[PDB]
Amino acid sequence: MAHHHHHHAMVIDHILKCVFDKICKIGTESVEAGRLIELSQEGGGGGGPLYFVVNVIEPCKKFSELTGLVFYLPTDSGEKMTESKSVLKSLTEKLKKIVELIPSTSSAVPLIGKYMLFTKEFVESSIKITEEVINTHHRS
Numbered sequence: 041m042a043h044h045h046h047h048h049a050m051v052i053d054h055i056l057k058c059v060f061d062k063i064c065k066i067g068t069e070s071v072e073a074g075r076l077i078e079l080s081q082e083g084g085g086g087g088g089p090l091y092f093v094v095n096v097i098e099p100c101k102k103f104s105e106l107t108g109l110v111f112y113l114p115t116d117s118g119e120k121m122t123e124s125k126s127v128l129k130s131l132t133e134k135l136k137k138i139v140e141l142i143p144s145t146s147s148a149v150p151l152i153g154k155y156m157l158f159t160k161e162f163v164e165s166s167i168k169i170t171e172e173v174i175n176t177h178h179r180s
Contacts (some may be wrong), residue, residue, distance in 0.1 A: 048114070048173065056111035059169055066162060070155050077151050099131040110166060112150040118167035118176040128160060 044051045072164075074092070075083070083089055106124040114120065140177040 048176075051174070052114075053111060055169060056108075059165060060091065062162075063166070066159065070159070073088075073155055074152060077148060080146075081145060081148050081151075082155065085145045095135065099127065099152050101135075110170075114177075115168075117177055121166040121170070125163060125166075128163060132156065 042051065075089075078089075078092060083092075085091065103124060104171045106120060110124075136149065
């Protein structure tokens with residue numbers, strides 16, 4: 041869209057809506073395959089449908105502030121990002137362990153898992169975009 045050779049704050053704060061936009065495109069669309077696949081098996085388990093949004097949004101919350109610390113308080117070409125990404129892989133560890141509580145729904149692991157890695161590979165965009173500004177960040 042533009043370049044504007046200068047400090048990063050006015051034009052850098054705008055890019056946020058650029059990376060946060062797509063996230064909703066494929067992120068909001070998954071809201072269907074997530075409830076469609078679950079309900080197909082049972083959509084319940086140890087509790088109700090709130091356990092799916094409570095366990096999914098739980099980790100997302102702490103990340104909500106992270107998405108704002110990368111487009112506002114950048115520590116590097118992908119510091120706050122690469123540091124927050126490690127949480128996405130370590131987070132699933134809590135969902136995969138569900139087999140110890142309700143292994144009945146675990147059968148969906150290989151079902152919904154197709155979407156899991158999907159976003160995991162999309163979140164990388166965070167460091168991808170910054171790869172364009174790194175040209176200056178790295179230098180100075």
